[PDB]
PDB file of all heavy atoms in Angstrom:
ATOM      1  N   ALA U   1      32.551  35.979  62.387  1.00  0.00           N
ATOM      2  CA  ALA U   1      32.808  37.402  62.551  1.00  0.00           C
ATOM      3  C   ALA U   1      34.216  37.780  62.090  1.00  0.00           C
ATOM      4  O   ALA U   1      35.199  37.028  62.367  1.00  0.00           O
ATOM      5  CB  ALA U   1      32.598  37.840  64.024  1.00  0.00           C
ATOM      6  N   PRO U   2      34.401  38.893  61.387  1.00  0.00           N
ATOM      7  CA  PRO U   2      35.700  39.237  60.861  1.00  0.00           C
ATOM      8  C   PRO U   2      36.496  40.145  61.790  1.00  0.00           C
ATOM      9  O   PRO U   2      35.900  40.656  62.781  1.00  0.00           O
ATOM     10  CB  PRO U   2      35.376  40.006  59.599  1.00  0.00           C
ATOM     11  CG  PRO U   2      34.138  40.763  59.981  1.00  0.00           C
ATOM     12  CD  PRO U   2      33.352  39.810  60.899  1.00  0.00           C
ATOM     13  N   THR U   3      37.745  40.355  61.481  1.00  0.00           N
ATOM     14  CA  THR U   3      38.638  41.284  62.138  1.00  0.00           C
ATOM     15  C   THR U   3      38.718  42.573  61.309  1.00  0.00           C
ATOM     16  O   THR U   3      38.960  42.502  60.093  1.00  0.00           O
ATOM     17  CB  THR U   3      40.031  40.669  62.341  1.00  0.00           C
ATOM     18  OG1 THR U   3      39.928  39.500  63.137  1.00  0.00           O
ATOM     19  CG2 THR U   3      40.997  41.653  63.010  1.00  0.00           C
ATOM     20  N   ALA U   4      38.541  43.720  61.917  1.00  0.00           N
ATOM     21  CA  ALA U   4      38.686  45.039  61.224  1.00  0.00           C
ATOM     22  C   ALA U   4      40.115  45.464  61.309  1.00  0.00           C
ATOM     23  O   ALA U   4      40.762  45.345  62.340  1.00  0.00           O
ATOM     24  CB  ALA U   4      37.769  46.025  61.932  1.00  0.00           C
ATOM     25  N   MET U   5      40.606  46.023  60.184  1.00  0.00           N
ATOM     26  CA  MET U   5      41.920  46.692  60.184  1.00  0.00           C
ATOM     27  C   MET U   5      41.890  47.891  59.199  1.00  0.00           C
ATOM     28  O   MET U   5      41.133  47.906  58.247  1.00  0.00           O
ATOM     29  CB  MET U   5      43.000  45.659  59.802  1.00  0.00           C
ATOM     30  CG  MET U   5      43.047  45.299  58.284  1.00  0.00           C
ATOM     31  SD  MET U   5      43.824  43.729  57.922  1.00  0.00           S
ATOM     32  CE  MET U   5      42.679  42.577  58.765  1.00  0.00           C
ATOM     33  N   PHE U   6      42.709  48.903  59.506  1.00  0.00           N
ATOM     34  CA  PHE U   6      42.864  50.023  58.633  1.00  0.00           C
ATOM     35  C   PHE U   6      43.815  49.649  57.476  1.00  0.00           C
ATOM     36  O   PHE U   6      44.711  48.858  57.690  1.00  0.00           O
ATOM     37  CB  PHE U   6      43.395  51.273  59.329  1.00  0.00           C
ATOM     38  CG  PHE U   6      42.459  51.857  60.380  1.00  0.00           C
ATOM     39  CD1 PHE U   6      42.778  51.838  61.732  1.00  0.00           C
ATOM     40  CD2 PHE U   6      41.251  52.439  60.014  1.00  0.00           C
ATOM     41  CE1 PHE U   6      41.895  52.316  62.677  1.00  0.00           C
ATOM     42  CE2 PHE U   6      40.407  52.977  60.935  1.00  0.00           C
ATOM     43  CZ  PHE U   6      40.726  52.918  62.283  1.00  0.00           C
ATOM     44  N   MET U   7      43.556  50.244  56.291  1.00  0.00           N
ATOM     45  CA  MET U   7      44.488  50.194  55.150  1.00  0.00           C
ATOM     46  C   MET U   7      44.834  51.630  54.778  1.00  0.00           C
ATOM     47  O   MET U   7      43.957  52.373  54.335  1.00  0.00           O
ATOM     48  CB  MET U   7      43.880  49.486  53.941  1.00  0.00           C
ATOM     49  CG  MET U   7      43.916  48.010  54.030  1.00  0.00           C
ATOM     50  SD  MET U   7      43.554  47.309  52.377  1.00  0.00           S
ATOM     51  CE  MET U   7      45.213  47.460  51.617  1.00  0.00           C
ATOM     52  N   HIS U   8      46.069  51.972  54.932  1.00  0.00           N
ATOM     53  CA  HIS U   8      46.524  53.369  54.683  1.00  0.00           C
ATOM     54  C   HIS U   8      47.209  53.458  53.299  1.00  0.00           C
ATOM     55  O   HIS U   8      47.399  52.467  52.639  1.00  0.00           O
ATOM     56  CB  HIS U   8      47.464  53.812  55.805  1.00  0.00           C
ATOM     57  CG  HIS U   8      46.804  53.871  57.163  1.00  0.00           C
ATOM     58  ND1 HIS U   8      45.673  54.648  57.415  1.00  0.00           N
ATOM     59  CD2 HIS U   8      47.060  53.227  58.318  1.00  0.00           C
ATOM     60  CE1 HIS U   8      45.333  54.493  58.688  1.00  0.00           C
ATOM     61  NE2 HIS U   8      46.157  53.660  59.246  1.00  0.00           N
ATOM     62  N   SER U   9      47.524  54.688  52.904  1.00  0.00           N
ATOM     63  CA  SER U   9      48.144  54.896  51.583  1.00  0.00           C
ATOM     64  C   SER U   9      49.478  54.217  51.440  1.00  0.00           C
ATOM     65  O   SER U   9      50.343  54.392  52.326  1.00  0.00           O
ATOM     66  CB  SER U   9      48.237  56.420  51.249  1.00  0.00           C
ATOM     67  OG  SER U   9      48.265  56.695  49.853  1.00  0.00           O
ATOM     68  N   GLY U  10      49.645  53.459  50.378  1.00  0.00           N
ATOM     69  CA  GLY U  10      50.888  52.701  50.104  1.00  0.00           C
ATOM     70  C   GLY U  10      50.944  51.328  50.793  1.00  0.00           C
ATOM     71  O   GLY U  10      51.859  50.567  50.512  1.00  0.00           O
ATOM     72  N   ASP U  11      49.974  50.981  51.618  1.00  0.00           N
ATOM     73  CA  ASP U  11      49.964  49.707  52.316  1.00  0.00           C
ATOM     74  C   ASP U  11      49.728  48.575  51.349  1.00  0.00           C
ATOM     75  O   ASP U  11      49.139  48.762  50.296  1.00  0.00           O
ATOM     76  CB  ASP U  11      48.930  49.697  53.422  1.00  0.00           C
ATOM     77  CG  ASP U  11      49.281  50.629  54.615  1.00  0.00           C
ATOM     78  OD1 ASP U  11      50.288  51.387  54.543  1.00  0.00           O
ATOM     79  OD2 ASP U  11      48.540  50.580  55.607  1.00  0.00           O
ATOM     80  N   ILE U  12      50.289  47.405  51.677  1.00  0.00           N
ATOM     81  CA  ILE U  12      50.177  46.189  50.819  1.00  0.00           C
ATOM     82  C   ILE U  12      49.694  45.042  51.689  1.00  0.00           C
ATOM     83  O   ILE U  12      50.070  44.908  52.856  1.00  0.00           O
ATOM     84  CB  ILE U  12      51.530  45.865  50.165  1.00  0.00           C
ATOM     85  CG1 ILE U  12      51.933  47.011  49.193  1.00  0.00           C
ATOM     86  CG2 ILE U  12      51.447  44.572  49.405  1.00  0.00           C
ATOM     87  CD1 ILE U  12      53.288  46.908  48.599  1.00  0.00           C
ATOM     88  N   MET U  13      48.949  44.143  51.057  1.00  0.00           N
ATOM     89  CA  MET U  13      48.316  43.004  51.725  1.00  0.00           C
ATOM     90  C   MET U  13      48.485  41.773  50.869  1.00  0.00           C
ATOM     91  O   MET U  13      47.918  41.713  49.758  1.00  0.00           O
ATOM     92  CB  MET U  13      46.815  43.242  51.849  1.00  0.00           C
ATOM     93  CG  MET U  13      46.300  43.582  53.263  1.00  0.00           C
ATOM     94  SD  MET U  13      44.500  43.852  53.283  1.00  0.00           S
ATOM     95  CE  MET U  13      43.980  42.473  52.287  1.00  0.00           C
ATOM     96  N   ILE U  14      49.179  40.759  51.369  1.00  0.00           N
ATOM     97  CA  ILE U  14      49.179  39.469  50.727  1.00  0.00           C
ATOM     98  C   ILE U  14      48.156  38.601  51.456  1.00  0.00           C
ATOM     99  O   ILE U  14      48.091  38.544  52.640  1.00  0.00           O
ATOM    100  CB  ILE U  14      50.556  38.812  50.717  1.00  0.00           C
ATOM    101  CG1 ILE U  14      51.523  39.463  49.729  1.00  0.00           C
ATOM    102  CG2 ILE U  14      50.463  37.330  50.303  1.00  0.00           C
ATOM    103  CD1 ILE U  14      51.831  40.908  50.074  1.00  0.00           C
ATOM    104  N   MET U  15      47.275  37.929  50.652  1.00  0.00           N
ATOM    105  CA  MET U  15      46.398  36.894  51.137  1.00  0.00           C
ATOM    106  C   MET U  15      46.946  35.587  50.503  1.00  0.00           C
ATOM    107  O   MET U  15      46.666  35.314  49.329  1.00  0.00           O
ATOM    108  CB  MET U  15      44.932  37.081  50.765  1.00  0.00           C
ATOM    109  CG  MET U  15      44.331  38.335  51.362  1.00  0.00           C
ATOM    110  SD  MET U  15      42.569  38.590  50.944  1.00  0.00           S
ATOM    111  CE  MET U  15      41.833  37.248  51.885  1.00  0.00           C
ATOM    112  N   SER U  16      47.776  34.881  51.313  1.00  0.00           N
ATOM    113  CA  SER U  16      48.336  33.614  50.921  1.00  0.00           C
ATOM    114  C   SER U  16      48.006  32.514  51.896  1.00  0.00           C
ATOM    115  O   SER U  16      47.639  32.742  53.015  1.00  0.00           O
ATOM    116  CB  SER U  16      49.862  33.761  50.767  1.00  0.00           C
ATOM    117  OG  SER U  16      50.444  34.120  52.058  1.00  0.00           O
ATOM    118  N   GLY U  17      48.179  31.278  51.443  1.00  0.00           N
ATOM    119  CA  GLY U  17      47.925  30.087  52.279  1.00  0.00           C
ATOM    120  C   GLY U  17      46.483  29.985  52.671  1.00  0.00           C
ATOM    121  O   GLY U  17      45.594  30.265  51.842  1.00  0.00           O
ATOM    122  N   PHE U  18      46.248  29.628  53.913  1.00  0.00           N
ATOM    123  CA  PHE U  18      44.900  29.567  54.509  1.00  0.00           C
ATOM    124  C   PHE U  18      44.004  30.824  54.286  1.00  0.00           C
ATOM    125  O   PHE U  18      42.799  30.693  54.092  1.00  0.00           O
ATOM    126  CB  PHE U  18      45.021  29.326  56.002  1.00  0.00           C
ATOM    127  CG  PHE U  18      43.800  29.500  56.810  1.00  0.00           C
ATOM    128  CD1 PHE U  18      42.809  28.559  56.781  1.00  0.00           C
ATOM    129  CD2 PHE U  18      43.638  30.610  57.613  1.00  0.00           C
ATOM    130  CE1 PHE U  18      41.637  28.725  57.524  1.00  0.00           C
ATOM    131  CE2 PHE U  18      42.527  30.789  58.379  1.00  0.00           C
ATOM    132  CZ  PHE U  18      41.508  29.842  58.344  1.00  0.00           C
ATOM    133  N   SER U  19      44.682  31.983  54.232  1.00  0.00           N
ATOM    134  CA  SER U  19      43.928  33.240  54.061  1.00  0.00           C
ATOM    135  C   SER U  19      43.410  33.475  52.642  1.00  0.00           C
ATOM    136  O   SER U  19      42.422  34.184  52.512  1.00  0.00           O
ATOM    137  CB  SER U  19      44.836  34.423  54.453  1.00  0.00           C
ATOM    138  OG  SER U  19      45.798  34.733  53.485  1.00  0.00           O
ATOM    139  N   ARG U  20      44.005  32.865  51.612  1.00  0.00           N
ATOM    140  CA  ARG U  20      43.603  33.021  50.207  1.00  0.00           C
ATOM    141  C   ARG U  20      42.173  33.088  49.933  1.00  0.00           C
ATOM    142  O   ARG U  20      41.678  34.000  49.287  1.00  0.00           O
ATOM    143  CB  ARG U  20      44.091  31.849  49.323  1.00  0.00           C
ATOM    144  CG  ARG U  20      45.316  32.185  48.518  1.00  0.00           C
ATOM    145  CD  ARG U  20      44.991  32.607  47.078  1.00  0.00           C
ATOM    146  NE  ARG U  20      43.777  33.398  46.927  1.00  0.00           N
ATOM    147  CZ  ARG U  20      43.289  33.773  45.748  1.00  0.00           C
ATOM    148  NH1 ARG U  20      43.879  33.435  44.619  1.00  0.00           N
ATOM    149  NH2 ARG U  20      42.146  34.472  45.686  1.00  0.00           N
ATOM    150  N   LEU U  21      41.422  32.066  50.422  1.00  0.00           N
ATOM    151  CA  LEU U  21      40.017  31.891  50.100  1.00  0.00           C
ATOM    152  C   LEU U  21      39.089  32.332  51.238  1.00  0.00           C
ATOM    153  O   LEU U  21      37.936  31.924  51.316  1.00  0.00           O
ATOM    154  CB  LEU U  21      39.755  30.428  49.705  1.00  0.00           C
ATOM    155  CG  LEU U  21      40.530  29.955  48.480  1.00  0.00           C
ATOM    156  CD1 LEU U  21      40.435  28.449  48.319  1.00  0.00           C
ATOM    157  CD2 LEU U  21      40.080  30.681  47.208  1.00  0.00           C
ATOM    158  N   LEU U  22      39.544  33.202  52.107  1.00  0.00           N
ATOM    159  CA  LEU U  22      38.761  33.840  53.149  1.00  0.00           C
ATOM    160  C   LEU U  22      37.795  34.920  52.598  1.00  0.00           C
ATOM    161  O   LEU U  22      38.176  35.707  51.678  1.00  0.00           O
ATOM    162  CB  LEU U  22      39.620  34.478  54.222  1.00  0.00           C
ATOM    163  CG  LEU U  22      40.468  33.471  55.026  1.00  0.00           C
ATOM    164  CD1 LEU U  22      41.202  34.277  56.070  1.00  0.00           C
ATOM    165  CD2 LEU U  22      39.608  32.383  55.667  1.00  0.00           C
ATOM    166  N   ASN U  23      36.577  34.906  53.171  1.00  0.00           N
ATOM    167  CA  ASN U  23      35.618  36.004  52.991  1.00  0.00           C
ATOM    168  C   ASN U  23      36.169  37.308  53.510  1.00  0.00           C
ATOM    169  O   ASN U  23      36.676  37.381  54.646  1.00  0.00           O
ATOM    170  CB  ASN U  23      34.302  35.682  53.709  1.00  0.00           C
ATOM    171  CG  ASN U  23      33.439  34.722  52.939  1.00  0.00           C
ATOM    172  OD1 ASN U  23      32.780  35.157  51.986  1.00  0.00           O
ATOM    173  ND2 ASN U  23      33.367  33.457  53.349  1.00  0.00           N
ATOM    174  N   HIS U  24      36.076  38.395  52.744  1.00  0.00           N
ATOM    175  CA  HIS U  24      36.519  39.722  53.130  1.00  0.00           C
ATOM    176  C   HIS U  24      35.711  40.829  52.436  1.00  0.00           C
ATOM    177  O   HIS U  24      35.016  40.610  51.456  1.00  0.00           O
ATOM    178  CB  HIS U  24      38.009  39.847  52.848  1.00  0.00           C
ATOM    179  CG  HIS U  24      38.385  39.673  51.388  1.00  0.00           C
ATOM    180  ND1 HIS U  24      38.560  38.442  50.844  1.00  0.00           N
ATOM    181  CD2 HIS U  24      38.588  40.554  50.374  1.00  0.00           C
ATOM    182  CE1 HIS U  24      38.867  38.554  49.585  1.00  0.00           C
ATOM    183  NE2 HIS U  24      38.913  39.835  49.283  1.00  0.00           N
ATOM    184  N   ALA U  25      35.918  42.049  52.942  1.00  0.00           N
ATOM    185  CA  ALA U  25      35.179  43.202  52.418  1.00  0.00           C
ATOM    186  C   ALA U  25      35.836  44.507  52.780  1.00  0.00           C
ATOM    187  O   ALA U  25      36.849  44.540  53.518  1.00  0.00           O
ATOM    188  CB  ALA U  25      33.749  43.171  53.008  1.00  0.00           C
ATOM    189  N   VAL U  26      35.315  45.605  52.221  1.00  0.00           N
ATOM    190  CA  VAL U  26      35.676  46.946  52.621  1.00  0.00           C
ATOM    191  C   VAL U  26      34.367  47.680  52.958  1.00  0.00           C
ATOM    192  O   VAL U  26      33.664  48.202  52.051  1.00  0.00           O
ATOM    193  CB  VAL U  26      36.443  47.710  51.474  1.00  0.00           C
ATOM    194  CG1 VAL U  26      36.852  49.115  51.902  1.00  0.00           C
ATOM    195  CG2 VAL U  26      37.633  46.898  51.034  1.00  0.00           C
ATOM    196  N   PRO U  27      33.959  47.690  54.239  1.00  0.00           N
ATOM    197  CA  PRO U  27      32.725  48.369  54.562  1.00  0.00           C
ATOM    198  C   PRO U  27      32.802  49.900  54.545  1.00  0.00           C
ATOM    199  O   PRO U  27      31.753  50.546  54.527  1.00  0.00           O
ATOM    200  CB  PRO U  27      32.449  47.898  55.991  1.00  0.00           C
ATOM    201  CG  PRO U  27      33.799  47.733  56.539  1.00  0.00           C
ATOM    202  CD  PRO U  27      34.589  47.120  55.439  1.00  0.00           C
ATOM    203  N   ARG U  28      34.001  50.456  54.533  1.00  0.00           N
ATOM    204  CA  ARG U  28      34.085  51.904  54.657  1.00  0.00           C
ATOM    205  C   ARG U  28      35.404  52.497  54.123  1.00  0.00           C
ATOM    206  O   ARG U  28      36.480  51.981  54.380  1.00  0.00           O
ATOM    207  CB  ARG U  28      33.959  52.326  56.123  1.00  0.00           C
ATOM    208  CG  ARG U  28      33.957  53.792  56.396  1.00  0.00           C
ATOM    209  CD  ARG U  28      32.849  54.536  55.694  1.00  0.00           C
ATOM    210  NE  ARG U  28      32.654  55.869  56.224  1.00  0.00           N
ATOM    211  CZ  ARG U  28      32.080  56.155  57.403  1.00  0.00           C
ATOM    212  NH1 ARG U  28      31.643  55.212  58.251  1.00  0.00           N
ATOM    213  NH2 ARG U  28      31.961  57.434  57.760  1.00  0.00           N
TER     214      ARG U  28
END
């Protein structure tokens, strides 16, 4: 099961290390 988070205008997300190859999506 994943964790939900908001992404707002101008926000930035690094997926590095362990997170790199994680399953992810944008359901909405």
Side-chain angles (χ1 to χ4, degrees):
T3 300
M5 74 203 65
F6 295 113
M7 280 196 80
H8 297 302
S9 204
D11 290 6
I12 296 174
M13 252 181 46
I14 288 63
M15 296 182 69
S16 62
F18 168 75
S19 76
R20 258 266 35 186
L21 300 170
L22 295 182
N23 280 284
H24 58 278
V26 183
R28 183 60 166 286

